[PDB]
Amino acid sequence: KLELRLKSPVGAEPAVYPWPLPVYDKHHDAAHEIIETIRWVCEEIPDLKLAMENYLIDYDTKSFESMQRLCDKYNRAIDSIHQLWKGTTQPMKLNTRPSTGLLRHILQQVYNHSVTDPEKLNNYEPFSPEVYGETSFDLVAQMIDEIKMTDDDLFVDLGSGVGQVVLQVAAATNCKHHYGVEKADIPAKYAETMDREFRKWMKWYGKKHAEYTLERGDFLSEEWRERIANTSVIFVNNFAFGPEVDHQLKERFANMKEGGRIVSSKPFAPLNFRINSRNLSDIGTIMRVVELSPLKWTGKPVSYYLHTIDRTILENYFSSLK
Numbered sequence: 001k002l003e004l005r006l007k008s009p010v011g012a013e014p015a016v017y018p019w020p021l022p023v024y025d026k027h028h029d030a031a032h033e034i035i036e037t038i039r040w041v042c043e044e045i046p047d048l049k050l051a052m053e054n055y056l057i058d059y060d061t062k063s064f065e066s067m068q069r070l071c072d073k074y075n076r077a078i079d080s081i082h083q084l085w086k087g088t089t090q091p092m093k094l095n096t097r098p099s100t101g102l103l104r105h106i107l108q109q110v111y112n113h114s115v116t117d118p119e120k121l122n123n124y125e126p127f128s129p130e131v132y133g134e135t136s137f138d139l140v141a142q143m144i145d146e147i148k149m150t151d152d153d154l155f156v157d158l159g160s161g162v163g164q165v166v167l168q169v170a171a172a173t174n175c176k177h178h179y180g181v182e183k184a185d186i187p188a189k190y191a192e193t194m195d196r197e198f199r200k201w202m203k204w205y206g207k208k209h210a211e212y213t214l215e216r217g218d219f220l221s222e223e224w225r226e227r228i229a230n231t232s233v234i235f236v237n238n239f240a241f242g243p244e245v246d247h248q249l250k251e252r253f254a255n256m257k258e259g260g261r262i263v264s265s266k267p268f269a270p271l272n273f274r275i276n277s278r279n280l281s282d283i284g285t286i287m288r289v290v291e292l293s294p295l296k297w298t299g300k301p302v303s304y305y306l307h308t309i310d311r312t313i314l315e316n317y318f319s320s321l322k
């Protein structure tokens, strides 16, 4: 039937949209996704922005003719750019990581295409570890900015939901591998589509990401004990996990390497920890804990906390006993 098509700037399969264009939520639709996609491509390729600068128009997101018209202007401009690249003009640099602004758009696009019924993520057992909530792009970006990962680092989102934390980190850092592990059926199911849509859109934009895997599973399992021990950066949105789950996580953290880091929405050790002869076995003895600077109280997880595995604290206490 009626179709809208956007050509890829790097010659991947065109993106196809049905008419009428679908709505995602109260503030997101396919019409606007299309217009923003064109805008971001224009950001990627200055030549394209030029052509699009030359013969802007009153887009009626209501009108098919109008939307087909705008898509045509973009597709024609993409054709001419590809011809330009056949001449002397340098083509778009391949396999670079997306800009922060492009990444935000890509992840929203992937989410809207994969999470078909968002309401279904609220079907959890309340007052349980299953409680769903998403860390915002802005907080994830802060975590990336401040905890600096290198190609030596291994990153894991414990309880990864639909996987959008892991995708953002895979696109912004050069870790060897990123993992997400999610237990609940509904988000784990959506994460499978998120995985596919992300790999497809990233290829469409011609942008690179690191290796990652989104898995279904229980991060408290026997298998996961050793995986946690060998992870250098743990992200865990544990605000609603409870004391029992946190206690079990502490036990698994106590096997992590020196300099390992844990980012969480509820501290695993009090910020003002001081070693004495009664707390000698508390996880607080082997880590520093700092509250990440707030981004400029509600009831929902807002603040996040960085834990760094530092055994010199325990060592020091013993040297002082001598």
Ligand SMILES: C[S@@+](CC[C@H](N)C(=O)[O-])C[C@H]1O[C@@H](n2cnc3c(N)ncnc32)[C@H](O)[C@@H]1O
Residues within 6 Å of the ligand: 129, 130, 131, 132, 133, 134, 135, 136, 157, 158, 159, 160, 161, 162, 165, 181, 182, 183, 184, 187, 217, 218, 219, 220, 237
């Ligand atoms: C608040 S959500 C966090 C989603 C995502 N990591 C984020 O921050 O945007 C917490 C997730 O942890 C999951 N979870 C709880 N216990 C788990 C377990 N034992 N193993 C794997 N996932 C678990 C829940 O199913 C839930 O989807």
